């Protein structure tokens, strides 16, 4: 129950009753004011509120951003409208220790861009994964309907593929038939947008020929240890000793032979050659390692 503000302090041109603006467009809401000279040194605040919440304020009397409030004329200016700018706006002229002067409210409606939020992207699913999900959400005016189809010659979603009420594409017990290009369509009266994404099915490496040991030999003998892998993408193999990689850069080049088929052959075995040798198999999907003990008998 604060005292009323003086009559010469007033909002001359408040916001328009209703504005409709397209997302991406600039706009501005008005709050032209008259500030009498006998208050120029008082604490006077011009505030803009959105849905009842303070949004911008500037002191009018005593002591590149997208959304700014201009001191001289009270304009709330939007350099570019975004969907969340929609709401009910009101400006206030507030002298310290007095009742605020309230403008009429102004409704700001935004014609939203038809677009995905966010835009679906390509995914790699693990073979035999129990559940895998690909979200699809869009905005627009009105809110668009979202659906999934398969791209290409056969548009039907494979078995154990479904779309839930949120537009989420769901794969159950991922198998090789799930691989393909899948299209999310968002449709309303503004048109239709189409995000097609690659859904690949990958397989972490597995040993087809794992290293097998213990490998026992005598000094000056020759040993071989094997490593071959399968997977999708085609895995690479890498030899280590005690988790330290092995190559020509750190082994005797006339004794250690790294064959193309994954086999490691050690000629003229020495006592120091003993230890734990490992093969790591890897692709873009994952990694595995298996090790073997090399025993050198005196
Ligand atoms: C208020 O002043 C600013 C700064 O010059 C200007 O950009 C804006 O257009 C003005 N408001 C109106 C409604 O003209
Ligand atoms: C299209 O794909 C579905 C789902 O995998 C399958 O059941 C159907 O037989 C396919 N149709 C043709 C003509 O290949
Ligand atoms: C849809 O999303 C909401 C969250 O907005 C969640 O609570 C609900 O469980 C989801 N529905 C399904 C079927 O996943
Ligand atoms: C998707 O389309 C691209 C381009 O046509 C093609 O190379 C690819 O094999 C298709 N399928 C997947 C799973 O990416
Ligand atoms: C979706 O867009 C792709 C291009 O990315 C196109 O090849 C495909 O035919 C479109 N699908 C539909 C149902 O419009
Ligand atoms: C790799 O090739 C070498 C030489 O031909 C052979 O001795 C070895 O057994 C091969 N490894 C496997 C796992 O076949």
Numbering used by the authors: 246 to 308, 327 to 561
From the paper:
We crystallized the OTK ectodomain and determined the crystal structure of the last three D3-D5 domains (OTK3-5) to 1.97 Å resolution. The overall architecture of OTK3-5 is arranged in an extended conformation with substantial curvature resembling a boomerang shape. OTK D3-D5 domains adopt the I-set fold of the Ig-like domain superfamily which has been found in many cell adhesion molecules, protein tyrosine kinase receptors, and signaling molecules. The asymmetric unit contains two chains, and structural superposition of these chains revealed that D3 and D5 can re-orientate relative to the D4 domain by 28° and 40° about hinge points located in the D3-D4 and D4-D5 linkers, respectively, giving clear evidence for interdomain flexibility. The interdomain flexibility is presumably allowed by the small interdomain interfaces and a lack of strong interactions between the individual domains. Sequence analysis of potential protease cleavage sites revealed an internal furin site RGKR at positions 235–238, located between D2 and D3, suggesting that the ectodomain of OTK1-5 was cleaved by furin protease during crystallization. N-linked glycans were clearly visible and unambiguously fitted into the electron density at Asn336, 417, 429, 444, 457, and 524. A close inspection of the electrostatic potential on the OTK3-5 surface revealed two substantial regions of basic charge on D3 and D4. In the crystal structure, both basic patches interact with well-ordered sulfate ions from the crystallization solution. Binding of sulfate ions and notable similarity to consensus sequences (Hileman et al., 1998) for heparin binding suggest that both patches represent potential glycosaminoglycan (GAG) binding sites.
